[PDB]
Design a protein around this nucleic acid. Structure first.
Ligand SMILES: Nc1ccn([C@H]2C[C@H](O)[C@@H](COP(=O)(O)NP(=O)(O)OP(=O)(O)O)O2)c(=O)n1
Ligand SMILES: [Mg+2]
Ligand SMILES: [Mg+2]
Ligand SMILES: [Mg+2]
Length: 381
DNA sequence: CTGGGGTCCT
DNA sequence: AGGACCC
């Protein structure tokens, strides 16, 4: 029943890709910018006070010498992401992606086969690779300790393969479920790894200072729980199941309370190929239907390239907008003939479709403006 | 001065 | 179609 899970999280991912592209920025403090957001920075810049998701005014005010590179085109980051995932898939085929830079791998079967090859004189020689969370003592006679140590070794081999084959560094966490692996992977950063033995689970879980630090408890749930007087992990652990179900529904309640105990039975799922391909473009102002139409042509060209490279075809298209004060969208199926002709002028029909979808949302006869235009291709087969 | 992506559930 | 969550 007991699993060995690894979580891998790349060091300052976008920035790391930019530093590999141009080594002139290797030792300069570097931030990757998307409009007015420094979505990440390398660690040199973190030493001078730059933080992830700072806006660029605060970034340059805390660090006026910060070199900034534009990261609004995700192409290189995306390619690198899938190179990491495929490398990990070589170890065990079932790899779950989370964002562009995190991967879960279930090492249970691998650990088992490694232990079955070992002979009883060297079950005593098993050693950890990397950090043991909270300096907990290893008990070599504890089978769970043994298999988590093997997991730490596989994790080290994974990170070394990532470095030697792709030039990327990152952190790994080995634990008995996805939640604990992801929580322990960030304990020693950057480019380090930690293993969590079971006796320390509670310690790990109570090291958190607010519930929103738990993956699965987002902005809305956190705000609700705060309204309920729940602020610590122990608050949520000890809170009434009934009341919590009443305000969050049965699903959210049971899941996040189990999570607050460090319990997580969810399996590592094979991510495989993406379920969708989208591109966004935000701006201060779009009020011309001709302008929006040009934006939409542009997003669509790149999207066509990408979907054609995949080698499977989308069967639904969606357009998304944002009005100046949430988001709104309209989708529709992609006609069969246009679908058959992907990768012929697919562009003009797709444009007409997307523009009709556009006018369904926005009244051209009245005046408007828009702050975000996005196109998504989903329902791939 | 709040990007640009993704997942699954309702 | 929207909402919640993840990075
Ligand atoms: N809200 C977010 C979060 C992440 N990202 C991108 C930029 C990051 O380089 C990348 C990886 O996410 P991340 O791991 O949270 N941050 P990053 O890897 O840069 O730093 P560390 O993981 O080293 O702390 O996703 C984004 O564009 N918008
Ligand atoms: Mg990450
Ligand atoms: Mg990272
Ligand atoms: Mg959270």
């Amino acid at each position: 029943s007991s699993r060995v899970i690894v979580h891998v999280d790349l060091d300052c991912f976008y920035a790391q890709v930019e530093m590999i592209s141009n080594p002139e920025l290797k030792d300069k403090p570097l931030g990757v910018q998307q409009k007015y957001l420094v979505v990440t920075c390398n660690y040199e810049a973190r030493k001078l006070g730059v933080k992830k998701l700072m806006n660029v005014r605060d970034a340059k005010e805390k660090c006026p010498q910060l070199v900034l590179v534009n990261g609004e085109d995700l192409t290189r980051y995306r390619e690198m992401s899938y190179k990491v995932t495929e490398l990990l898939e070589e170890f065990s085929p079932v790899v779950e992606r989370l964002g562009f830079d995190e991967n879960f791998v279930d090492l249970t079967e691998m650990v088992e086969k490694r232990l079955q090859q070992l002979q009883s004189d060297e079950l005593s020689a098993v050693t950890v690779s990397g950090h043991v969370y909270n300096n907990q003592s290893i008990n070599l006679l504890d089978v769970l300790h043994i298999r988590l140590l093997v997991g730490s070794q596989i994790a080290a081999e994974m990170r070394e393969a990532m470095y030697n084959q792709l030039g990327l560094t990152g952190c790994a966490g080995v634990a008995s479920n996805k939640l604990l692996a992801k929580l322990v992977s960030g304990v020693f950063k950057p480019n380090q790894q930690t293993v969590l033995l079971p006796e320390s689970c509670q310690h790990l879980i109570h090291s958190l200072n607010h519930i929103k630090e738990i993956p699965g408890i987002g902005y809305k749930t956190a705000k609700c729980l705060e309204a309920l007087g729940i602020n610590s992990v122990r608050d949520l652990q000890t809170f009434s199941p009934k009341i919590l179900e009443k305000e969050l529904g049965i699903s959210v309640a049971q899941r996040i309370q189990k999570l607050s105990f460090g319990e997580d039975n969810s399996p590592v799922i094979l991510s495989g190929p993406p379920q969708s391909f989208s591109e966004e473009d935000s701006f201060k102002k779009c009020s011309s239907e001709v302008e929006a139409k040009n934006k939409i042509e542009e997003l669509l060209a790149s999207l066509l390239n990408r979907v054609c490279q995949d080698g499977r075809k989308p069967h639904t298209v969606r357009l998304i907008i944002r009005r100046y004060s949430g988001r709104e969208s309209r989708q529709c199926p992609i006609p069969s003939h246009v679908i058959q002709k992907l990768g012929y002028d697919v562009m003009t029909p797709m444009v007409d479709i997307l523009m009709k979808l556009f006018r369904n949302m926005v009244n051209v006869k009245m005046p408007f403006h828009l702050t975000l235009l996005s196109v998504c291709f989903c329902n791939l087969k």
